[PDB]
A paper describes a structure:
In the nucleoplasm, however, hMTR4 binds the RBM7 and ZCCHC8 proteins, forming the metazoan-specific nuclear exosome targeting (NEXT) complex. NEXT promotes the exosomal degradation of non-coding promoter-upstream transcripts, enhancer RNAs28 and 3′-extended products of histone- and small nuclear RNA transcription. We conclude that ZCCHC8 is a scaffolding subunit that bridges the interaction between RBM7 and hMTR4. In this work, we have shown that RBM7RRM binds a proline-rich segment of ZCCHC8 at the back helical surface and is able to concomitantly bind RNA.
To obtain experimental phases, we co-crystallized the complex in the presence of heavy-atom compounds. The structure was solved by single anomalous dispersion at the Samarium edge and refined to 2.0 Å resolution with Rfree of 22.6%, R-factor of 20.2% and good stereochemistry. As the two structures are very similar, we focused on the highest-resolution atomic model, which includes residues 286–324 of ZCCH8 and residues 7–86 of RBM7. Side-chain electron density was well resolved throughout the RBM7RRM–ZCCHC8Pro interface. In the complex, RBM7RRM exposes the front β-sheet surface to solvent and engages the helical back surface in binding ZCCHC8Pro with conserved interactions. Overall, ZCCHC8Pro adopts an unusual elliptical conformation when bound to RBM7. The RBM7RRM–ZCCHC8Pro interaction is dominated by conserved hydrophobic contacts that can be grouped into two adjacent patches.
Numbering used by the authors:
A (entry chain A): 7 to 86
B (entry chain B): 285 to 324
Write the structure that this text describes.
Amino acid sequence: EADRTLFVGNLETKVTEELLFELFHQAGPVIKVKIPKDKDGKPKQFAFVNFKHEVSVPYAMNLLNGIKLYGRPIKIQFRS
Amino acid sequence: RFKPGVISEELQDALGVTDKSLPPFIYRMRQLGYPPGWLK
Ligand SMILES: [Br-]
Ligand SMILES: [Br-]
Ligand SMILES: [Br-]
Ligand SMILES: [Br-]
Ligand SMILES: [Cl-]
Ligand SMILES: [Sm+3]
Ligand SMILES: [Sm+3]
Ligand SMILES: [Sm+3]
């Protein structure tokens, strides 16, 4: 459930689900990364990361919050 | 098997890492400990 998910914001426009998958894979096994779309099909500037293990969520916050992707620090928030 | 800090060229460039330089998050990983989700 939400126990295993993180919100990642402040994404530079070139950040993709693939790139975020690889980065957060360093914190623990990742199931999927979702960058949502608007009604017109445009990608948003934030993502949801779904981990395999809840324990990876607090660790990923400490490991990766503020890390710069294409010069912009990602902003991680808990969802639960 | 999990390989900490082994990342693709696309991710290196995204992180601003030049050749033979540690990814920025590795400096944190070394103090935080081994990622619990990869413990085996
Ligand atoms: Br994408
Ligand atoms: Br949404
Ligand atoms: Br949320
Ligand atoms: Br290491
Ligand atoms: Cl997508
Ligand atoms: Sm559960
Ligand atoms: Sm729980
Ligand atoms: Sm690709």
